[PDB]
Every structure is written in structure tokens, then in C-alpha cells.
Write a protein that binds this ligand. Structure first.
Ligand code: MA4
Length: 265
């Protein structure tokens, strides 16, 4: 594979779309690679990580409990609820909803949680509270994935997302237990985690949340690193490309490959 920056460019050329990327040291926030880092990209399902960060903040504040059981109705369910559709009779705890939203990308679980934090406006306010003045959530699942051209709704920038993730996971804004919890949810992703591990060389750590949207929108926020350590935050977003899912997956994997082969920068 070629150098990270050149692979990224090659992906735009082959996809005919915009790629947004950031590679950042998790512990210090040192930025190694930045491409269209300040350009807007739809967050898609990657927003669920920030959503649960806000939930944990409420738990830390004593205004929420991961144990609190939420009961909902079939009428509250939206497209794709693999976990939540199974507990119409017994409900799910707030903690279970975050696990389902992050590890299975359950959409109803995400909406249920979104309500508890004040809807899209409330999560956006939370973002502003932690110093992210760029990221914004405006809609609920699954409308937030529309990815209309030039539409600023439900977007983030690679730079903003990486900084926010690092804040949630390491800045001690969240309690130690909460930071560890958010990390474990990403470690437990069942949607892309196993697949990624199946292609990662031995010794490489992976934690993540992926997303997909209209007009080729695709994305991943992840922790990656050799020697089995979450050394770096890697955020990659794609938009406005007519390419198949398979090819968009391949291009992202290719950027990952360039990182792996040229890790020491
Ligand atoms: O010298 C480095 C390595 O080169 C290969 O590893 C290959 C691997 O066989 C392939 O499957 C992967 O593509 C997959 C890359 C990861 C896909 C997900 C990437 C994500 C994860 C984090 C966010 C960014 C994107 O590339 C690497 C690097 O060439 C060898 O197989 C391995 O023995 C050797 O250690």
C-alpha cells in the first residue's frame, strides 16, 4: 500500500466522492493525518457514540442510571431494531439501549436514548458544552441519514469528531467508570468489529462504530493501534459517491492498510 495521504487521494479519485479523514493520538490529541478535516460530512450511525457519551454524562451527574428500565411500545419502533423489537414485553435498561445502539446500531434504541437527552437539540447542546461548536444533530433515526448535497443537518467534521471522541474517552469529563464503559461499547461492536478483526494483522487493536447513508455516505470512527493498544483515533467519512457499498468498504479498508504499513509517523 502507498502512504496514507496518497491512498486517501486515490480513494477520492476511484470513488468520485469526498473523503474526510483524521488520524489522531488518543492520549495526547496529536494530529498525524488530516484531509478535508474541517469539511462537513453526515455522521450517520456514528452519532450513537456521542449520544451515549451524553447519556453517561447524565449518569455521572446522578440524573440517569444505566439500570433504569425503559418500557416502550411497538409504535415507537423505527426501521431496524434487531434488539429493541425483542423486548416489547419486558423493556430494556438505559445501559442496554446504549449497547444495542452502539454494538448493533439498533435505531429505536437510539431514538429512545435521544429522547432522554433532549432530542437532537439536546445532544447538540451537550456537544456545545464539551467545546464542540461544529457537530450538530438535527433529526432522528432514520431521517438523519439522508445526506442531501449541501445539507448541514446531522453533520460533523473529521477534526471535530476526533476531538469530541478523545474528550469523551479520555479528558476526564466523564467519570472513570463511564469512560471505560463507552470504550467497551465500541470494543463490542458486532456490526463491523468481527469483520475488521478478520482482516487486521495479528496484534492490532480495534474498537469502532460505523455508519452509512444516501448518495454513498459512509463512515467509521475507530480506535486503532499495534501491540494490542488503542493508540490512535481514526475517523473516516465518505460522501457523494455512487460506488457500491462493497467498494466504499474496500476503499476505507485500503486507507487502513496504508496506515498499518506506515504506522510510524
Ligand atoms: O506489514 C504489515 C502487514 O501487511 C499485511 O496486512 C494487511 C492485511 O492482510 C489486510 O487485510 C489489511 O487490509 C485491512 C485493513 C483494515 C481494514 C479496516 C480499516 C479501518 C480500521 C480503523 C479506521 C480506519 C479504517 O491491510 C494490511 C496492511 O497491508 C500482512 O498480511 C501482515 O502479515 C503484515 O503485518
Amino acid at each position: 500500500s502507498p502512504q496514507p495521504l496518497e491512498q486517501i487521494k486515490l480513494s477520492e479519485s476511484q470513488l468520485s466522492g469526498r473523503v474526510g479523514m483524521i488520524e489522531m493520538d488518543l492520549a495526547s490529541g496529536r494530529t498525524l493525518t488530516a484531509w478535508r478535516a474541517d469539511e462537513r460530512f453526515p455522521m450517520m450511525s456514528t452519532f450513537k457514540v456521542v449520544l451515549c457519551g451524553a447519556v453517561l454524562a447524565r449518569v455521572d451527574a446522578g440524573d440517569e442510571q444505566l439500570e433504569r428500565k425503559i418500557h416502550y411500545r411497538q409504535q415507537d419502533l423505527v426501521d431496524y431494531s434487531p434488539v429493541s423489537e425483542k423486548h416489547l414485553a419486558d423493556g430494556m435498561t438505559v445501559g442496554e439501549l446504549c449497547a444495542a445502539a452502539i454494538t448493533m446500531s439498533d435505531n429505536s434504541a437510539a431514538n429512545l436514548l435521544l429522547a432522554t437527552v433532549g432530542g437532537p437539540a439536546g445532544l447538540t447542546a451537550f456537544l456545545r458544552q464539551i467545546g464542540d461548536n461544529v457537530t450538530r444533530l438535527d433529526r432522528w433515526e432514520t431521517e438523519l441519514n439522508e445526506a442531501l448535497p449541501g445539507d448541514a443537518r446531522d453533520t460533523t467534521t473529521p477534526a471535530s469528531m476526533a476531538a469530541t471522541l478523545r474528550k469523551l474517552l479520555t479528558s476526564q469529563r466523564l467519570s472513570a467508570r463511564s469512560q471505560r464503559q463507552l470504550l467497551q461499547w465500541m470494543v463490542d461492536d458486532r456490526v463491523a468489529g468481527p469483520l475488521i478483526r478478520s482482516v487486521l494483522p495479528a496484534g492490532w487493536f480495534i474498537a469502532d462504530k460505523t455508519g452509512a447513508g444516501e448518495r454513498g455516505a459512509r463512515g467509521i470512527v475507530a480506535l486503532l493501534g499495534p501491540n494490542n493498544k488503542a493508540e490512535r483515533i481514526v475517523v473516516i467519512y465518505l460522501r457523494d459517491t455512487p460506488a457500491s457499498m462493497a467498494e466504499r468498504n474496500q476503499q476505507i479498508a485500503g486507507i487502513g492498510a496504508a496506515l498499518i504499513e506506515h504506522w510510524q509517523r
